[PDB]
A paper describes a structure:
Kinesins are a superfamily of microtubule (MT)-based molecular motors that play important roles in cellular functions such as mitosis, cell motility, and intracellular transport. The kinesin motor domain is the MT-binding engine that drives these activities, converting the chemical energy of ATP binding and hydrolysis into mechanical force. Recently, it has been demonstrated that a subset of kinesin superfamily members, including kinesin-2s, −3 s, −8 s, and −12 s, are sequestered by kinesin-binding protein (KBP; KIF1BP; KIAA1279), which inhibits MT track attachment by their motor domains and, thus, blocks their MT-related functions. Here we present cryo-electron microscopy (cryo-EM) structures of KBP alone and of KBP bound to the motor domain of the human mitotic kinesin KIF15 (a 110 kDa complex).
To elucidate the mechanism of kinesin inhibition by KBP, we determined the structure of KBP in complex with the human KIF15 (kinesin-12) motor domain (KIF15_MD, 1–375). MT binding stabilises the tubulin-binding subdomain of the MD while the P-loop and Switch 1/2 subdomains – which contain the conserved nucleotide-coordinating P-loop and Switch 1 and 2 motifs – move relative to each other in response to the nucleotide state of the MD. The KBP-bound conformation of the KIF15_MD6S tubulin-binding subdomain is also radically different from its MT-bound conformation. The tubulin-binding subdomain forms the majority of the MT-binding surface in the KIF15_MD6S-MT complex such that KBP and MTs cannot simultaneously bind KIF15_MD6S due to extensive steric overlap.
Author numbering:
A (entry chain A): 1 to 36, 48 to 437
B (entry chain B): 1 to 44, 47 to 360, 369 to 436
C (entry chain C): 24 to 38, 47 to 125, 128 to 152, 157 to 249, 254 to 373
Write the structure that this text describes.
């Protein structure tokens, strides 16, 4: 069958992956042990157990040590959980050059072994961060190696974008740009969020006053589940990972979707509300409900995909899409009139006990490429320029094999990308 | 992994370090007999970072006690936690140091240093993966200044790829404690600039001010001042020894706090800091803690931060709290006081989080500031030194041990260069 | 003051779009597209240029100025395998004799001039040869040496404390010190260069003359720098990679110093971080200080080296802007 592989790299990605695997277990009916198209994400043992078709990497042991003592522990087979010695230290030049070129081979061999289980190896999932030290260079290296090996196979990146205003690390800007330099010419599709938007959504739609990492990760997990379920479950108008590549990559370099998931509704607000299909579609297209700091009015949607779940009717969805097209504010690109893919699954989303969300019969995941995101790119390049002008926090990077012209080349590439986006918009 | 070697040199360094060990032992559930009597598995998970285990569940600090006279270390032994140390880790002479950098660095310290180095080497060989070295010393004496500088140089020569951090008690210009203090301090700093990755700069004046204003302490004991320092030190390395939402390595902290190789002199701070009586008028929010951390009264270096700007700030929070609440609060602080944050660095701060409070608190935080304002401290020492040098005062004690005017001039030139660099990045 | 002298030397590719063209002795064409960039220095020598030609254009003047009491520095800067060592020292057992580089030729020229000057003036010449390996100093004149460090002086000289100073009466005697030391300087094999220099070599000749009494003292620094290296091309790993990290770092601070000086040379405020690296500290006088400095920038033509060649030229162009204030170092 069509079957996949999961990779979670860097602390953030590992955390996300925990939540994702919990969600999967709750959906398909798997215990903490492994007891009971389910095989896209769970290979069977001799009996009883099921093994997550997964890989877990971090150079910090403390992250995966936590995994190894939690409830979700003996679900995993210790072949997968790999650990390093000294962490990446928010330094691309340690994740790619120094400590990366040491344990990457082991991870590759594990991946190969796991593939030798897949008859129909459909592709991969990579979870990381444009902002961690591990997730910025090591991820890139892994992608490169996978390209060298397979090439034809499907590859996805779930990329936690640097939030324009809020930021977390001191050298988030350099790391992200270096990742862009290397990943851009390998990974055919990247699905991106930032934390600021998620926080906003929690405040407004869910009325949550305390924004924390667990609930945020759960939201991302739900999106991941929605993206997958086309492979994991039945439904009229189904979807493949390769179909995303075909649908959401007009030009081979431009491949940076946004994401969004509606409904984002609490226990109370589910009542005093009907939740119709058209309503949900409208909510998905709302400026604020978008999972990144990017006004969709400041550009044009090139290519859009919408993955409806549960009790849904095609005609209703079509009507909703027609209504959206009628709206003159939500602009589209002149040269692509057919900018929608419809995905419908009879499985409705199931939410994890002790979490943010309530039951909803009908939900959507919306994945969109736009000229409007270019503003975020420009902001990032401006940040990079501002701190590269002083050349501050550079003595970390130079020591682990680097060059000054690399940065310039990366900035040139970013400029070219911006120019391409502008051309597309025109 | 990532185990740390601890060194105490000179009287002040040794007494501070005793308290530091006492604090950390309590933190990790280690009683004065070297036995573990804690209640959590998290307490032992990473005990390797500071301790070695012996037969019979005995735990032993990987700590070295160095002194050129016996009395201080004898008092340490007599003390409560003194019997936890392995006796062969006491390295000491009998000939006094006379508050003389020359005696510590050139003559009496040179006689003892090789024996110290051999113990250092054994500890390094006993490490699964050496992270770095932590030193405690005064700046204004002979042992901490001369001997400590010597020791650091030799260790960086032996372990040039490892982290070298010092907690260094510095002079307070309004209340000098020794007559040759400027000489000792300038000679020490001349080598600390080159051979350390980070130095946490404490002056006793600031500690006294903290004790009087916030703790409502009419009568501070040196023990209480040492407790304050110890709390800072513990906080710095919490994320090496424990889990977290977003984690901090020592190297990563350097990674976020050092824009230029030389500028690694930090002002530490702590929160909460109140009396036993002025606590019930308060509640414990992330906002409250941040307010307290950025209060000048909660700084442990001798400067008004408003007499300069923060180049970079690292905050390490302990306890369960919303990441978004934290980030939002720090963004508000940046917005409202943007003039005190150098504009080269978007996201002026780094945040780290440790999912574990220190005993008897729900929440705590440690603050690490790198400010252009600290140039004033260097100025004051340079002027004090310079006046005495103009008259060649006290000089025969040092020239008699082979030191030369040119070396002193070099030290002054280094100091002036430091202040000039801070001026440049004002 | 007097601007530093910058020369660009184009090494021949091994036995073919060049991406580099020689406009004239004064100018070069690089082939970047779509839009061109032109660079002009003091002199550019193409691939055919002989070792003797290089000596005449760059070094002969500095030797003469050294005789007159000025301090003088010549250092080769460029990407790995660009020709720095070949230019400064020469082949290492190749053709060998005519191939010898600037350092041996300078010995020969200097001693001939002093012999000529003899016909109550006297000369005293001492030599030192040291390498900067991983921001550490090693004495090439004695392998036993350890614990070498840099020290500032009233003579404004930054010197290596405890370095062997060998008195040399003739060019031949100097050649022995050079040959022994050259063997000493650390070299390793990378994909880019089998003979790659892993350290920065500093050969120093102290020339003191007494006209009896007036005392003239000149420091002649002949520096063969290590080259910037991309790990992907060099395939440096392990100790080779550690050396590359140090080489790139010290070269980065050299660039930082050169840029800062440009800012200061124009009405501006900047700090030069001379003491960021041992190299920049030792070279402090050579860069903006009391010395006549000539920089030979070595470039490889060839499209593969396009980016690195760009970097070297950009650095050299900035260097040309730096003005030094050189005076005769005299005593009466
Ligand atoms: O320092 C030790 N341990 C701490 C904590 O784990 C802890 O339990 O702290 C106590 C400390 C007490 O004494 C207060 O602090 C002091 O008065 C003090 C004296 C000398 C130097 C520094 C502090 C405490 C206070 O300090 C600390 C460190 O928490 C001072 O401002 C804070 C705010 C606290 O709220 C206050 C005022 C308290 O009143 C609190 O009491 C109650 C009832 O909550 C106390 C603590 C929380 C206190 C009165 C008992 C530690 C910090 C960082 C790293 C590791 C440990 C320590 C360890 C062993 C033995 C003795 C002390
Ligand atoms: N959603 C989410 N994002 C996180 C989490 N932890 C960190 N991030 C984001 O990830 C970035 C920091 O990267 P990390 O993943 O923590 O770093 P790392 O990959 O572990 O690399 P090193 O720690 O440097 O070895 C920032 O943009 C954070 O906002 C988390 O638990 N959830
Ligand atoms: N002008 C030249 N004519 C002939 N051979 C040359 C020339 N320049 C360099 N080479 C050859 O190229 C090889 C040397 O590279 P070299 O010139 O030693 O590089 P380098 O700049 O010292 N490399 P690195 O030490 O890594 O910075 C030698 O064996 C030289 O003979
Ligand atoms: N916090 C603290 N500071 C001290 C202590 N003892 C001395 N100092 C400070 O250390 C400096 C004197 O150096 P000292 O260590 O006594 O000289 P040494 O014994 O030769 O190293 C002065 O600034 C003192 O205020 C102590 O027990 N605790
Ligand atoms: Mg991490
Ligand atoms: Mg060479």
């Amino acid at each position: 069958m069509r079957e996949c592989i999961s990779i979670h790299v860097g602390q953030a990605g590992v955390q996300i992956g925990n939540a994702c695997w919990e969600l999967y277990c709750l959906e398909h009916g798997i215990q903490p042990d492994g007891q009971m198209s389910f095989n896209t994400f769970f290979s069977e043992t001799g009996a009883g157990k099921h093994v997550p078709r997964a890989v877990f990497v971090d150079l910090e042991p403390t992250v995966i040590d936590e995994v190894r003592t939690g409830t979700y522990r003996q679900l995993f087979h210790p072949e997968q959980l790999i650990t390093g010695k000294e962490d990446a230290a928010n330094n691309y030049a340690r994740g790619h050059y120094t400590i990366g070129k040491e344990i990457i081979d082991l991870v590759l061999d594990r991946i190969r072994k796991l593939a030798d289980q897949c008859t129909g190896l459909q592709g991969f999932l990579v979870f990381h961060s444009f902002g961690g030290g591990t997730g910025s260079g090591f991820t890139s290296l892994l992608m490169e190696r996978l390209s060298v090996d397979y090439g034809k196979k499907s590859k996805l990146e779930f990329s936690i974008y640097p939030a324009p205003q809020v930021s977390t690390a001191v050298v988030e800007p350099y790391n992200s740009i270096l990742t862009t330099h290397t990943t851009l010419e390998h990974s055919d599709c990247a699905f991106m969020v930032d934390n600021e938007a998620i926080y906003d959504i929690c405040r407004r739609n869910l009325d949550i006053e305390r924004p924390t990492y667990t609930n945020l990760n759960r939201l991302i997990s739900q999106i991941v589940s929605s993206i997958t379920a086309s492979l994991r479950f039945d439904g009229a108008l189904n979807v493949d990972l390769t179909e995303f590549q075909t649908n959401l990559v007009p030009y081979p370099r431009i491949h940076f979707p946004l994401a969004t998931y509606a409904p984002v509704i609490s226990a109370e607000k589910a009542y005093h509300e009907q939740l119709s299909v058209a309503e949900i579609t409208n909510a998905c297209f709302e400026p604020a409900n978008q999972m990144v700091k990017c006004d969709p009015r400041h550009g044009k949607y090139m290519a859009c995909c919408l993955l409806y779940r549960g009790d849904v009717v095609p005609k209703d969805v079509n009507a909703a899409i027609a209504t959206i097209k009628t709206k003159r504010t939500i602009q589209f690109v002149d040269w692509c009139p057919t900018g929608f893919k419809v995905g419908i699954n009879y499985q409705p989303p199931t939410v994890v006990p002790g979490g943010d969300l309530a039951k909803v019969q009908r939900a959507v995941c919306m994945l969109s490429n736009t000229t409007a995101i270019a503003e975020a790119w420009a902001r990032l390049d401006h940040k990079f320029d501002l701190m590269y002008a002083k050349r501050a926090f550079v003595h970390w990077y130079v020591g682990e094999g680097m060059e000054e012209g690399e940065f310039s080349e990366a900035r040139e590439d970013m400029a070219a990308l911006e120019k391409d986006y502008e051309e597309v918009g025109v | 992994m990532r185990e740390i070697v601890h060194i105490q040199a000179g009287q002040c360094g040794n007494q501070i370090g005793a308290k530091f060990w006492e604090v950390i032992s309590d933190e990790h559930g280690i009683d004065p007999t070297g036995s573990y009597h804690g209640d959590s598995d998290l307490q032992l998970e990473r005990i390797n970072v500071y301790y070695n285990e012996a037969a019979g569940n005995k735990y032993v600090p990987r700590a070295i006690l160095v002194d050129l006279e016996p009395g201080t270390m004898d008092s340490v032994r007599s003390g409560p936690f003194g019997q936890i140390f392995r006796p062969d880790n006491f390295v000491f002479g009998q000939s006094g140091a006379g508050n003389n950098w020359a005696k510590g660095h050139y003559t009496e310290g040179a006689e003892l240093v090789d024996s110290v180095l051999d113990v250092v080497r054994k500890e390094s060989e006993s490490c699964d993966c050496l992270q770095g070295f932590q030193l405690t010393h005064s700046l204004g004496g002979g042992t901490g200044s001369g001997m400590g500088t010597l020791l650091i140089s030799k260790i960086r020569e032996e372990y040039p790829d490892r982290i070298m951090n010092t907690f260094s008690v510095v002079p307070s210009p309004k209340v000098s404690d020794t007559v040759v203090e400027p000489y000792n301090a300038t000679l020490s700093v001349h080598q600390l600039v080159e051979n350390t990755d980070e130095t946490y700069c404490i002056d006793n004046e600031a500690l006294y001010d903290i004790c009087f204003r916030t703790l409502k302490l009419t009568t501070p004991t040196y023990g209480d001042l040492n407790h304050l320092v110890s709390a800072t030190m513990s906080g710095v390395t919490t994320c090496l020894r424990f889990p977290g939402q977003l984690n901090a390595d020592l190297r990563k902290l350097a990674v976020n706090m050092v824009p230029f190789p030389r500028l690694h002199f930090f002002m530490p701070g702590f929160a909460p800091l109140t009396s036993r009586g002025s606590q019930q008028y308060r509640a414990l929010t992330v906002p409250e803690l941040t307010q307290q951390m950025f209060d000048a009264k909660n700084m442990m270096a001798a400067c008004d931060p408003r007499h300069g700007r923060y180049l970079t700030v690292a905050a390490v929070f302990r306890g369960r709290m919303s990441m978004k609440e934290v980030d939002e609060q720090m963004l508000n602080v940046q917005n409202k006081n943007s003039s005190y944050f150098v504009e080269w660095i978007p996201n002026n701060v780094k945040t780290a989080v440790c999912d574990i409070p220190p005993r008897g608190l729900k929440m705590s935080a440690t603050f690490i500031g790198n400010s252009t304002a600290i140039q004033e401290l260097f100025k004051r020492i340079s002027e004090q030194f310079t006046a005495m040098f103009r008259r060649k005062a006290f000089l025969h004690w040092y020239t008699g041990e082979g030191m030369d005017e040119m070396e002193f001039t070099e030290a002054e030139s280094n100091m002036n260069d430091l202040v000039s660099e801070y001026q440049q990045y004002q | 003051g007097d601007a530093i002298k910058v020369f660009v030397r184009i090494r021949p590719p091994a036995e073919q779009n060049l991406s580099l063209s020689v406009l004239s002795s004064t100018s070069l064409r690089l082939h970047s597209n779509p839009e061109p960039k032109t660079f002009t220095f003091d002199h550019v020598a193409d691939v055919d240029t002989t070792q003797e030609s290089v000596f005449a254009t760059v070094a002969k003047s500095i030797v003469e100025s050294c005789m007159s009491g000025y301090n003088g520095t010549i250092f080769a800067y460029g990407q790995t395998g660009s020709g720095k060592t070949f230019t400064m020292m020469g082949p290492s057992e190749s053709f060998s004799h005519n191939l010898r580089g600037v350092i041996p030729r300078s010995f020969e020229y200097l001693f001939s001039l002093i012999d000529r000057e003899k016909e109550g003036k006297s000369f005293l010449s001492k030599c030192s040869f040291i390498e900067i390996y991983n921001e550490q100093i090693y004495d090439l004149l004695d392998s036993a040496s350890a614990g070498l460090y840099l020290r500032e002086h009233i003579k404004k000289g930054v010197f290596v404390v405890g370095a062997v100073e060998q008195v040399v009466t003739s060019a031949a005697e100097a050649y022995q010190v050079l040959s022994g030391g050259w063997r000493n300087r650390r070299v390793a094999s990378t994909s880019m260069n089998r003979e790659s220099s892993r350290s920065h070599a500093v050969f120093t000749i102290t020339i003191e003359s007494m006209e009896k009494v007036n005392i003239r003292t000149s420091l002649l620094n002949l520096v063969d720098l290590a080259g910037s290296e991309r790990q992907k091309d060099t395939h440096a790993e392990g100790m080779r990679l550690k050396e590359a990290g140090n080489i790139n770092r010290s070269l980065s601070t050299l660039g930082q110093v050169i840029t800062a000086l440009v800012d200061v040379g124009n009405g501006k405020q900047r700090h030069v971080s001379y003491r960021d690296s041992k190299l920049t500290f030792l070279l402090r006088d050579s860069l903006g200080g009391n010395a006549k400095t000539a920089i030979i920038a070595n470039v490889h033509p060839g499209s593969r080296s396009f980016g690195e060649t760009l970097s070297t030229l950009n650095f050299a162009q900035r260097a040309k802007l730096i003005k030094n204030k050189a005076v005769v170092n005299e005593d009466t």
